[PDB]
Ligand binder design. Structure first.
Ligand SMILES: O=C(O)CCC(=O)C(=O)O
Ligand SMILES: O=C(O)CCC(=O)C(=O)O
Ligand SMILES: O=C(O)CCC(=O)C(=O)O
Ligand SMILES: [Mg+2]
Ligand SMILES: [Mg+2]
Lengths: 447, 447, 446
């Protein structure tokens, strides 16, 4: 946490390189390595770079600054120190996640990490609360297709919770869990998922900032370790048609005055008014939240309306057909599971929009709808229309238009992130709608 | 034209087979061959089948009837008799396009050919008019990719109007023109088009029914002759990205009382009020007409808003940037060119919706907007919004919703064609939005 | 107890705990929990060992719907074991669990709990102990050198053959060590009649301990074979024109801590209880084969009209009948139910066998005379006169018999009985609609 503690770990573990890590607007991690010199002179050089930070070209980073005003800085968060395990042990490489700051030493407006810090500090100042998140980011382990090396296929024909040799990833998951534990993660469980070659490594919930720092490190940990075992890991929301997609279910809850505010022993379903107001806010801005939490064109092939997916804007207890599911655990573990996100989203912006829409419901005391205990997939469109169960947008452009007209998320993300995200994603959407796809060639070349 | 004239040709020219041709809802031609026997017994058998028609399973044809009411008939149109040239000369194979009729001998409601006959007879009864159309259906000649035989590429690296050997299709176009002339076509011109391997074979204008019969025979003629020269012809609206797409510009005009009603010697641009009322009607239902005239998902990659295409809903004189272009020819040849269609559409339904929207403007005497002589592609979106130049839908589903809410085209096509077309195209759209495309795999597998 | 498990984990450096269970088809399913260092890791492991953990039940075959997926696992601490094939440094251990609902009640559709229920009902009513000893045979395969997409047997060997004719003494050496480390009492290991077919026998125990060892055995043979560059299969008939994988079930019931099947002063030294139990198995034989032989391929080994344990009759030391009474007497007196194959769920296989047998013990049903003659040498007209009926010829024929059988419906329960028939009817439909390679060979020429 302090400068002295970080420098003490450098001497103990024999750290030789310090990675000053951060994230671009789309959530892609970016970093620069600093070599630590031997003796006290190297320790005190590292101290200056840890306290004052270092400069970098901001124009090359996505959604940051123009070429005419490119000079920027990185101020390290000393609480996020971690030794990278996949790197060598002798002359080890450690990391330090930083906050992007302007030349004048002021936090950068277009920084996703600073955006999440801002809304969390505002929440702690106004309500004395702590926003806790616990995601379930799923991924696919791939191998080259033997019939064609240019294409990739799943690593095994395994199912949900399957055992070896049907599940060919116990060794890959073993090293992933060991690597995460060394990085400071509290791993809860690991297993094979529904689709072939799909896996899920869960970890303990924590405050939104520590959880978002963990999601970035988790994605790198999964990809780097897969390359060591001759495989390629992908967090694509739907790499293959006809099989389950990678989903990042976000279990979340707010604790006002160090108490579980979502729990109420004397209430319906043992859920407090604060919980219902929060759920109402998420459901209100659901069509706009999916623009940030599902930012790829491929995300709307997993999260596809009219088909089995968490597309139905409604909440329910122990039901995976609705967008929100309230797990049966009560007391401290009382929470809500927002099932719409996929691991393709920027965690810093995903937790910001979820907390902003949720707090909009708490501030205004919005009324939540009744829980749809029935299976929503079995219902007909005329029946769902009578109940008022609306669906999330069918494509990326449909979600961007909803985000653009939403003022709650515009204020939470800020003018810089809101406008740059829409501009980057509209160019991405335009590239998709103009390209001639393989489906079109298969269906229309014969005509 | 009469039964005796057809049988007299069959007797002398040694015709052995008679193809009873027709089209499904999507415009795909369908036929059954009838062998003609020698002597008077064979001619009297053919006479009965020509006058009374023959039965067929309607459930197997797309957008026709259910399995529980499948029995249907084909009543030949003796005016469309033609000798297929690509077939042998000795013991030749002749064709006769037919009207689909129900078991009770009544014209089938879901027949595209009967749909066009109905609206033309209604126009001739109400106004004493004749609807003339002259299309320019472009196509691509393809060859297998040498680096991969599973994919196809253009036959040559030729440009617009290029000469041999740069243009490698003079021999292919030569045989196409000879085949069309034998089928009764009045070929006007033939040449290489802008994109590599793209070509265009133009033919004289005629009444909508004779023109739609010619478009079906043209598509078959271009594909069969290409297979003879070891190539594969495709009428796909956009087979390759980054190069021009196949467009079917429809030059059209209406003649009330055997006179060119679109021409007016003493008027602005030498164009009559009837012409302006017709143009106003096309521009009014432009967003709904493109559902029929551009029925494929790929059509919206050629006809793509925001990019160089005939997407801007406006008319202009000798300007190819607008949806309508008024060619400089005057007098009898005074006409309007609807540039939005591509050869993937059903010609019988395309001419029906164009005549219905155009006549809606003539009946109500709608006011047309001013001609946009300026290049519309060079204009900015804010400038086009001030002028009021709206754009055609960006995708197939966006056009189907416009067609569904349009009552003018619903009545012209009829309940059977209107509902079956929307149902077939919505299932086609759902297949596209759920499939994982090659673009998505290229862009998101790395994440 | 909880402390016994925690003390082994503390000293031996165990790092992963597999919470294992089975779906309706007997396919094993599990999730790994990482054990942290120090007292904090041991206290975290204590919580998850006593209270259990949650899992998506809808994704498991034959469990619950999507709108009611919250389910838990309650570890049976007596089933603790170290997985030998996994690494020794930072070792991996397992714990077989019982599926429980959100309300903390045993799940009705759980196969393991289904066997516990009938065993506890038996010990409460008759004070008995149901002992079973299976012989789950398997096939070690290798890719066909003429085509890598197909698999063939590993060696051109025979029954009990010696190396180099038998090329699996190295593979069976490691299978026996792996099972010994898991806590198995291995009795014999050898090659079987067909090429590449092998057998590893283990000592009998109570039906639950045996069913846990059947799941652990199936995984052990497959993981050890994949280490030696081969692929093991417990398919009931992978190749035509040779023996199939059979899982003979040597079973017996001990009322009041004594061998009730033995009677020193009786015919064949077999008690009245044994003859009543055999009469019950033969009565429900047409229905038991639906559970003990649930695959379509099972009826290609267990094929009527051809040499197999298809004939519904009993005999001493005769392998032609469905039941064979081994010549061992005293404590080792038992009956061998020969129809089963290693493709079945053991928990459901022992449940239907005990329930059908106890139906004969409760009603005191009379068994027929033993058919000491070779049944394969008999004609169909002779077998009809004696009353020797045969087991169903296909999967769908067995599912109809199981559906009408009320004795096995109540033993499996409304949840397991209905989901099994639904899963197997959909499986049968997939087979009868598909155009098989036999049809292409016989009818493409016409
Ligand atoms: O496979 C896992 O999920 C974690 C690692 C493990 O259990 C193992 O090494 O066997
Ligand atoms: O090439 C054409 O467009 C028509 C055929 C022709 O002119 C030729 O045979 O050279
Ligand atoms: O082959 C067997 O059955 C057990 C192992 C053995 O005997 C050997 O290692 O030679
Ligand atoms: Mg999951
Ligand atoms: Mg024949």
């Amino acid at each position: 946490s302090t400068v002295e503690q970080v420098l003490e770990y450098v001497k103990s573990n024999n750290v030789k390189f310090m990675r000053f890590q951060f994230v671009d607007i789309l959530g892609v991690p970016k970093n620069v390595a600093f070599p630590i010199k031997a003796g006290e002179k190297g320790i005190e050089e590292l101290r200056d770079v840890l306290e004052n930070g270092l400069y970098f070209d901001g124009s090359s980073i996505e959604g940051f600054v123009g070429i005419n005003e490119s000079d920027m800085m990185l101020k390290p968060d000393l609480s996020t120190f971690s030794v990278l395990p996949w790197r060598p042990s002798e002359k080890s490489v450690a990391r330090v996640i930083c906050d992007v700051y302007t030349t004048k030493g002021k936090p950068f407006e277009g920084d996703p990490r600073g955006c999440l810090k801002r809304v969390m500090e505002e929440f702690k100042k106004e309500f004395n609360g702590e926003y806790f998140v616990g995601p379930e980011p799923e991924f696919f382990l791939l191998k080259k297709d033997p019939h064609n090396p240019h294409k990739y296929i799943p690593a095994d024909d395994g199912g949900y919770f399957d055992l070896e040799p049907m599940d060919e990833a116990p060794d890959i998951r073993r090293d992933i869990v060991f690597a995460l534990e060394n990085l400071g993660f509290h791993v809860e469980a690991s297993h094979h998922e529904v689709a072939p070659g799909q896996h899920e490594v869960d970890f303990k919930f924590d405050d939104a900032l520590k959880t978002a720092d963990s999601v970035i490190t988790f994605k790198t940990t999964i990809k780097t370790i897969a390359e060591q075992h001759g495989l390629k890991a992908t967090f694509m929301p739907k790499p293959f048609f006809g099989m389950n997609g990678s989903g990042m279910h976000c279990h979340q809850s707010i604790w006002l005055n160090g108490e579980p505010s979502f729990y109420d022993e004397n209430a319906p379903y043992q859920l407090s008014e604060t919980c219902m107001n929060y759920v109402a806010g998420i459901l209100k801005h659901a069509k706009a939240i999916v623009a940030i939490t599902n930012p790829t064109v491929n995300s709307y092939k997993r999260l596809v309306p009219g088909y089995e997916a968490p597309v139905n804007i409604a909440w329910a207890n122990s039901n995976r057909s609705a967008i929100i599911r309230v797990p049966a655990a009560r007391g401290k573990g009382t929470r809500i599971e927002f099932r719409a996100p996929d691991p393709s989203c920027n965690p810093y912006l995903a937790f910001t929009v979820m907390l902003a829409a949720g707090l909009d419901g708490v501030k205004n005391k919005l009324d939540a709808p009744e829980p749809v205990e029935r299976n929503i997939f079995a219902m007909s469109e005329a029946e769902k229309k009578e109940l008022g169960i609306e669906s999330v947008p069918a494509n990326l452009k449909a979600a961007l238009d909803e985000l653009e007209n939403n003022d709650v998320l515009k204020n939470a993300l800020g003018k810089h992130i809101f406008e740059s995200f829409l501009e980057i994603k509209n160019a991405e959407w335009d590239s998709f709608r103009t390209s001639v796809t393989d489906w079109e060639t298969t269906a229309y070349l014969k005509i």
